[PDB]
Symmetry: C3
Subunit: 344 residues, 3 copies
C-alpha cells in the first residue's frame, strides 16, 4: 500500500449526546412444552406424559439463564324265520338309533362349543383390531409430536444463543461502565460516536442506558494523508501523528483534528530501509464439524426387518359335502305289500 491518500480529518466540532441502549439480562422464559407443543387433543397430553421429563430440565436450562301237517310245521318254521328277521331288524334299527343319535350328539357338541370358539376368536380379533388402531393413531401422533418437539428444541436453542449474546453484551456493558463512566476513553466512536468526554449511566428494565456526552466533527475537509515517506531508502514514522500538508508542506498533526505541527525529529521515527513486513490474514474462522450422514439404505439395512407372511387356512376342510339317502321306493313297495297282506 504505503501510498499517500486522503482521509477526512476534522476541523470544527459540535456537542453530541449519543444515548445508546444495551441489554444486560433476560426474562425467565419458562416456556411450557405442553402449551408450545400442545394446544388441543387431550390425547397429545396423554402421549407427552410418556415423553420423558424433558420440559422440566429444558426449563431448568432456561431458568439457569437468569299229509298236510307238513304245511303247518314248515310254514311255522318260516314264520319263526320271519321272527328271526324282525328281531334282527329291531337289532339293526336300534343300532341305527343309537349311532345316528350319537352322531347328532357330536353334531350338537361341535355346534355349541364351536360357536364358543367363534365367540372367543371373534372377541380376540376385535381387540386385536382395537389395539392395532390405537397403535396406528398414536404412532402418527408421535411423528407429529417428534417434529413439533424438535421445533421446540430449536426454539430453546435460539433462546440460549440469545442468552449468550446477552452475557457477552453485559460484559461489554461492564467494560463500558468501566471505561466510559469511570474514565474518558481515548477511542474514536467508542463510548458513543465521536470523541468521548463523559458518559452518564442509567438503568432500564433489562438494559443499561448510556448517555454519552461526546463531540463530533461538525466541519472537516477531505484532506491528504500519508502513513510513511521514503526519502533516502529511509522511512518516517509520526508518533501519534499523520503526515499532512497545508497545501503542499509536509506536517504531522493529531488524528482528531489538524493543527499541522511541523515535522520534528522526535515525533518522526525512522527505519533504515523502506521494507514492508507482510502480515498474517484471515482470523475469526470457526470450523463447524457437523460432518456426515449416509443414506437411509446404509442406516436402514444395518438394522431392519421386512418380515411379512400370509396365512393358508384351507377351507376345503369345510368344503367336503354330505351325501344323503332320498329313497322311498322301499316305503312304497312296503305299504303295497301291506295292502297285499290285508287282502288275503
Amino acid at each position: 500500500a504505503y501510498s499517500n491518500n486522503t482521509i477526512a480529518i476534522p476541523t470544527n466540532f459540535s456537542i453530541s449526546i449519543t444515548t445508546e441502549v444495551m441489554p444486560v439480562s433476560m426474562a425467565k422464559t419458562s416456556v411450557d412444552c405442553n402449551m408450545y407443543i400442545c394446544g388441543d387433543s387431550t390425547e397429545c397430553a396423554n402421549l407427552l406424559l410418556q415423553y420423558g421429563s424433558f420440559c422440566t430440565q429444558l426449563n431448568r436450562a432456561l431458568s439457569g439463564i437468569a299229509n298236510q301237517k307238513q304245511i303247518a310245521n314248515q310254514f311255522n318254521k318260516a314264520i319263526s324265520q320271519i321272527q328271526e328277521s324282525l328281531t334282527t331288524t329291531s337289532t339293526a334299527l336300534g343300532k341305527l338309533q343309537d349311532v345316528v343319535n350319537q352322531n347328532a350328539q357330536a353334531l350338537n357338541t361341535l355346534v355349541k362349543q364351536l360357536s364358543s370358539n367363534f365367540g372367543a376368536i371373534s372377541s380376540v380379533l376385535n381387540d386385536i383390531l382395537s389395539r392395532l388402531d390405537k397403535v396406528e393413531a398414536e404412532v402418527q401422533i408421535d411423528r407429529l409430536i417428534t417434529g413439533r418437539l424438535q421445533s421446540l428444541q430449536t426454539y430453546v436453542t435460539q433462546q440460549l444463543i440469545r442468552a449468550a449474546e446477552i452475557r457477552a453484551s453485559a460484559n461489554l456493558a461492564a467494560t463500558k461502565m468501566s471505561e466510559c463512566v469511570l474514565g474518558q476513553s481515548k477511542r474514536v466512536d467508542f463510548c458513543g460516536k465521536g470523541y468521548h468526554l463523559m458518559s452518564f449511566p442509567q438503568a432500564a428494565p433489562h438494559g443499561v442506558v448510556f448517555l454519552h456526552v461526546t463531540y463530533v466533527p461538525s466541519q472537516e475537509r477531505n484532506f491528504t494523508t500519508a502513513p510513511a515517506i521514503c526519502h533516502e531508502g529511509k522511512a518516517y514514522f509520526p508518533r501519534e501523528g499523520v503526515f499532512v500538508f497545508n497545501g503542499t508542506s509536509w506536517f504531522i498533526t493529531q488524528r482528531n483534528f489538524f493543527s499541522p505541527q511541523i515535522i520534528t525529529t522526535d515525533n518522526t521515527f525512522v527505519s533504515g530501509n523502506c521494507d514492508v513486513v507482510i502480515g498474517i490474514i484471515n482470523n475469526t474462522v470457526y470450523d463447524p464439524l457437523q460432518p456426515e450422514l449416509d443414506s437411509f439404505k446404509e442406516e436402514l439395512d444395518k438394522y431392519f426387518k421386512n418380515h411379512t407372511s400370509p396365512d393358508v387356512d384351507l377351507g376345503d376342510i369345510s368344503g367336503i359335502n354330505a351325501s344323503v339317502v332320498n329313497i322311498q321306493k322301499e316305503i312304497d313297495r312296503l305299504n303295497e305289500v301291506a295292502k297285499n297282506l290285508n287282502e288275503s
Copy 2:
C-alpha cells in the same frame, strides 16, 4: 444533558494487584449417549441401535470443539312278497349304512382337519398378540427415548454455546496478552481494575491466569464535573480534560486525577454554537425468528387416518341344531309281533 454534575475524581492512589482468570480451552467432553440416555434396561440398548449413528457425529461436533292248493300257492306268493319286502329292506338299510357312515366320515373329516384350522389360527393369533405387545412396549420406550434424546441434544447445545463463549473469551485472552502484557493499556479498569502498569501472564489447566500490576484510587473526592460550558452561545471542549473547580475556579485536569491545570486556549476546543447533536439508540438487538406453530388439528388433519372397523363372524352359522329320531315303538311292536310269530 449537558449539565455540570459531580464525579468522584481520584486524589491519592495505592498499589493493587488484580489476579484475574479467564479460561481458554475446553475438556473433550466425549459424552456417551448410551450412558446419558441409558442406564439400565438392555432393551433400551436394543432400541438405540436403531437410533441412527447420531451419537458418533454428536461427539464429532463435541470433539471438534477442542280246493286248498289255492292256499299253498297264494300264500307262497305272499311269502315271496315278504321275500321282496325283506330284500327291499336290505336295500334300504344298506343305503342307510353307507350314507350314515359317509356323513360320519365327513364328520370325522371336519373334526380332524378343522381342529387343524383351529390350531393354525390359534398359533397365528398368539403370534399376532406377541408381536403386537412388542410393538406396544417398544413404542412406549420410543416415546421415552425421544424425550430423553432431545434432553441430551439440549445438553450438547448448552455445551456448544459454552464452547463459543470460550472461543470469544480466548480471543479476549489473546487481546489482553497483546495489550496488557506487551503494552501498558491506557484504559480504566481494563487489564484489571484501576490503572494498568504491567501484567504478568501465567498458565493454568484451561485458562491464562493474569497478574495485573495496577494502581487504584485509595483517596478521592466527590467533586464537581462539567462536560462543556456555553458562555457566548459558544461551547468549550477540554482535550484530554474535564472542567473542574478548586472551590469555584474553572480548571481542566486529567481524568485520572486532578492537578487542576488552568483553562488554556489550546486544550479547550470551541463550537460556534451550543447545539446538541442527537444520537442513535438501541444497538445489539437480535431477532430470534422462531416463528410459529399451528395446532395439532391443522398438522394432524393434513396427514392422519382414523381407520377402525369391527368384524361380523356370524356364529348362527353354528347355531342351527340337529333334529333327531328317538322313536322305539317300532322296535316294541316289532318284538311283540315276534312274540306273536313264535306263538303260532
Copy 3:
C-alpha cells in the same frame, strides 16, 4: 509480585502491513431436511410428511440469520301282524330318512357357512398381518428418522452458533472500522499487529478486509523492567511510564520504545506505603445447568404397560369323534331268509 524483571522493550522499528480478514455476514443456508435426512427410500418421504412442518420454521430461523279254517284265519291274523310290522318299518325308516337327511342338511349348513367364517377370519387375519407389518417397518424407520433428525437439529444449532459468532465479529468489524479507520488507535497489536498508523478498509464477499498500515519492532533488547519501587515504605508510579535502566541508572520511558527520560517528580506518583491491594479472580465463567436425567427404570415405570396374554381356543371341541355302525349280519340273514322264503 512487585519485582523488577525484564521485558523486551523496542529499539528500532520497521513498516508492516497486516492485511487481516474478518467475516461479517452469512450465506442463506436454506438446508432442505428432505435432502439432509432423506436421500432415497420414497417411504422416508412418505413419513417425513407426518413429521410436522419443522423444516419450514427451521429454515425460517436459518433465513432470519441473514277243523282247519283255524289255520286260515289265525295265520291271516299273523299276516296282518306282519302288515302291521312292515307299515311300522315304513314308519321307522321314513323317520330315519327325514332325520338323517336333516342332520345332513345341518352338516351342509355348517360346511358352507363355516367355510364362509373361515374366509372372513382368514381375510381379516391377513389384513391384520399386513398392517402389523406396516407398523413394524415404519416404526423402525421412525427410529432411524428420529436419530437422523436430531443430527440435523445439531447441524442447525451448530449453524446458529456460527451466526452468533459472525454477529459479534461484525460488531468487532464495526468497532474496528470506527477506531482503526476513523482514528489512530493507541493500542498495541490491535488494529493489526504492532503499532497502528492507519488502516485501509475494503470489502469482500462476506467479510471486510482490512489493510492496517502499522509498524513493528525490527530491533529491541531483553531489558530490565520494574513496575514500582519502595525506597522509604513509599511507592513510585510512572504515569505513562515503566522503570528502566541505562545499565544501572533508574529512568522511566514510554512503553513503545525507550528514550530513557529521567525520573521526575511529576511522572512518578507516590503512595504513602507499599501495601498491595489484592484483587478479585476468575471471571467469564458460565454455569451450563443441564442438570439431571434418572434411569429408564424411573421414567419407564411411571408410564408403562407390559400387557401380554395368550389364547385358549380349545380344539378338543373338535376332537370328539363320530361313532358308526358297520354291521351287515342283518343284511346277510335277511337275504338268507329271502332264500328260505323263495324255497317253500
